[model samples]
Target: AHFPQTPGFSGTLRPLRIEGDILDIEIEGEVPPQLNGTFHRVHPDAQFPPRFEDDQFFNGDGMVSLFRFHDGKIDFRQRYAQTDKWKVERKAGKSLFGAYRNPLTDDASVQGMIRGTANTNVMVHAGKLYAMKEDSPCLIMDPLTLETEGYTNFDGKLQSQTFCAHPKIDPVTGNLCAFAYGAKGLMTLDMAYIEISPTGKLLKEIPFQNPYYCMMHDFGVTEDYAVFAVMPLLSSWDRLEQRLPFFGFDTTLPCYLGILPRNGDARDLRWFKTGNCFVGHVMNAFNDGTKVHIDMPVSRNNSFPFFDVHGAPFDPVAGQGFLTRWTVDMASNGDSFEKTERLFDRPDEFPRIDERYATRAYRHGWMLILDTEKPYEAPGGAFYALTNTLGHIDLATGKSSSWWAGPRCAIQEPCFIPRSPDAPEGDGYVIALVDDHVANYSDLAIFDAQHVDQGPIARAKLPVRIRQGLHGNWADASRLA
Candidate 1:
């Protein structure tokens, strides 16, 4: 099967349906002796030629990659998530799935099949790995062998068809807090907030309706609240019937932040409306009494150009994302946010924080920064911007530092690993994939979490190039075996 030579399907972003193991990956500097575990990440790698030449980059099959670390040695492995769609397409020996998130264009034989690509995020919790996409149920996989164990509904406890790609694990209680929008079906107002025990049993499922249906790609969970950023990536049956993109950026629509008490019923949900903006991914959130704060990558307009706008041309300038915080007061009677503050000046996305301090007030944050002024020596490929730097921000000190990957390289999302189980908040190592276009390969760059400006302390070279990925997480050795 030959993929199209389209903008999103060619060059470094091309499909790589490979599954194998590489032992003892070559390293430049010493690997932290205490850093022991696996870094699990996923990318959308199409298994067959796309049915449409212009299919979205997000419509490909999920390929999960693992970077296993133990006793100063690293091993690499990758495998497909093996979704229902992948199985059907594999048997057909051709591309049968249609556009991204659109079931109307699917082949008649597989019209009622689950359309989830499982391409957005991969996480490990409760001793099991979950490969998730917002449009479908979570697919369970083995953490060590990377074997798909089929879709799960928490032992038939979940009522929704969809699950969130981004879920938060409460550091205090070890509970997984998650939610699902468009829960009833495609283009519906139904939504669900869920919580599971540390042992992987479903504990709660609070259902609610959004003010409006939008792309709630990511959200935040504090010690006592769950925060949802309802941006204007609007969708409707009319758009689907008209064959428009399933989602479109509506400039006229106002953004909303929904704050819900962790243990409250659906009737207790409160929405704080704000001006129109785009929030890519949340960094962290916490509460101070009745005041709840969420940190994320915010943009003036729709950050995703592929979705396009409702009735206007796309504005590239307004699409740049900056690290910002949205603060809301639960005691306020008005439906307005207390304030929105920009934490970083430059455009950045893919925010991450130390998981141990996830739901509480903490210090360090890391993200991929797009240095627009820097020269780009290679084609832009599938990404909207060249994410050329890894940044570290200290919230307590209000100081920020960054490390550039040069003009010829683009960096993926960074994951933080504590130096020890009891290490300080910011005292850890940051690991990310750096695509060296000049070298035609990729390498894992590791940096001191507090000193990103000093560059990578070590790098693990890959024999083959790994395609761009979406989200990933780190699992300590205790979580394995």
Candidate 2:
């Protein structure tokens, strides 16, 4: 029991490294007959005790979990992503990697191996499941069996060493639009915008340079442009040399929103500047003529305490994020944004929209909200902020609704599944993982997407607790064929 009894590694957040299958899981309510799909999600669960006791929670191995719903019932499966790093550590019978994204701290034997955890996000594209991490090549897996098939560089067409976790699918064109910062190497200013065909073919690769080397976690895409919100979560070779954290927020640097035409190169990119703010996962983006807009959760200060401000302490109050919109006009010559508007006052993140409305004007959105007013029964573990509510936002009417998960519980990112292939914009269901700290188990909560305030219409119970997860997506049964 060498595992540290810290906030992230002990208790409900402890690593399980379990792999098994469970059929016909117990249901608490009537399962909707129309829902038939698998919700693919992942979390960082260390396979063995970390090499260092003070390691960060993000360095754990990627464990992919699947919840398949069909015939008014649900099934469960879980497996490790089997990355190169995982294979090496499994053979050695312990952890050889030392720190999160810090190569200097790694063991000498595994110096040149790919260090991707593949723990960030999982999505289905072209009949294959892609397990992604922003720092290394993506691992391809058989979606139906959850078997790791090794990493891919678009069959040696991808020139970069890394792939983005938050790639967006264009509803209009059915193409995947993604980008990788630090494309050249660690702490580099290089980046690449990529597009892949619906059939898993490489379409285009545009190389560019960023304003600075920072953590470009996620971005947004309109019908005509891909938007990059470059915040000042700064990193440097010096920091790595000094054994400091991989990212640190710089208060003095201004944020930049770089908009690039879908068919244009780096020379055609436009940069719009704004005051320092933390923009989390993008909700959606759309445009009207030359004007473009992106919605996301924006915070006044650094939300990650581990990635602290260079010389300042973490401001918990300022870390609370709210839904905000950033607007920019392509016709304008000024470098500043046209306007910034706060869409919702609630503290939320992991914003999601119906994929059918992606890259276009959409009316509905969903996210996990942190209600600080609610009673919390225990420590939140790795999740410093307890997201206890499932929230829905109606953009057209400016109305909002939410359902609290009660005290001693927290929720993960919600994935939207359309009612049918031809359903209306938001006619769908929202599914998420709800963790009960008091009971030490997890449940898959399902809600009528349009009426989240009424609480889940059904919940599929799980035998074991799932650690906090990062991102996931819904894949229909037809896609499996």
Candidate 3:
């Protein structure tokens, strides 16, 4: 059970706090800082004075800079005045391997999804936004401004190779490491950064052993180890079914959350794995459990090789087949790591989900699930959430409590600011970025994290319909603070 007994499947938790209460974001003109170049060099040509443009990479816009929004206020990199001078600009490139096409003419604005921001102010290691024609080079960027901070990427070893941010800072070493898979045996993991000062000189790189395509926007890191999650996939999962992720509406890959020691070589790294499929969101509290993994499935195994002809032999088939389950396990140590698995998909009887896109709301046990299905036949539907998605189940009673939009508007991830129990009447609410299909834009919705089912306290609509995207920090408040 992911979530144990939570009242009303939710409660007042708190009121949502958001800026721009404006219904739509009024952005004039086009993007600034025009940058269109090959792997060796990319120049930033500003369309607007000072502030540059935003570039989405091949995968999508996956930029992760620091931001804090509280009491209706937001700020990024608050502590360090020195590192506050820059911003990160994102790009949409092709694959790290292979001959590719220049998407420069079109809207290359994509995601730098899968990037890691170092706790130190030193070199910012960005995993080149992956997918399509991209590179394996660890392209370095400005840690403060969120732009290309460094001219030398990974000590200049991978200048031509594209690196996407799927990074985790090594707690013990203080080095920021990120990775992405590429061609030419290029699908390797790399770690680089100073072990001493935040801006200490950058270090040589170390590689990760596994041949992973790309992490699905979720990876965990402890002081001495970086836990890399690998969902066993068939090579066919990428080639034939490029457009679709193998998982269906009902099931997912057996998740394998693995641990790689910081000191070990990529080749000798020890691994601790679990269920192959993950919902893409894994929180800390759960990270300490026995299997230490969380997943959600609407229905199970509809058929073998659930993916259409494209996902044939490689992907898991969907449809009602297995009982729902959830799992929790202890983090592994080199001395003792017993492989574990527990079917706890249902908190007693209902299905539980741990979806992604929530940094402001990191305290965990629960997750999100988008109810919108892709259109093989027509346009995809809007998304929605299901509360009580997962929590401890009461087998004896067999009764379950759940929450959902249950109606209009599919909400994306909900960002929450914490509060002491007596701090305020509605201080613990989770704010949402609602994707209103009718309005064709992303709106804001605040829900009572404690009583999520009661509906949003407020819904502030955004001016633009965010393209299918993931990962971002609330930086507005911090910009001026």
- Candidates in order have lDDT scores of 0.87, 0.87, 0.32
- Per-structure clash totals for the candidates: 0, 0, 107
Tens-digit per-residue lDDT, 1-481, candidate 2: 4778776677777768898899998899888887788889999988988877767767789999988889999999999999999999999998998877889888999998898899999998888999999999889998878999999989789998889999999887778889998897788888999998888888988889999889999999998999999999888767767777777877778999999998899999999999988878899999988999999889987765534345467787788889999999999998978899888888888899999889899989999898888888766454456789999998898899999999888899998988889999788789999999878889998899999988988989998888888999998887775
Model 1 misplacement above 4 A: 305-314, 380-383
* lDDT at residue 392 of model 3 (Cα atoms): 22
Clash pairs of candidate 1? none
Q: Score every model by TM-score.
A: 0.97, 0.97, 0.50
TM-score between candidate 3 and the true structure: 0.50
- Superposed on all Cα atoms, the candidates' RMSDs to the truth, in angstroms, are 1.4, 1.4, 13.5
Name model 2 segments beyond 4 Å from true. Answer: 305-313, 379-383
lDDT of 3 by residue, 160-236 (tens): 23333334344334354543343233332433212212333444334544534433333444444445555543233
Model 1, position 184, has a per-residue lDDT of 90
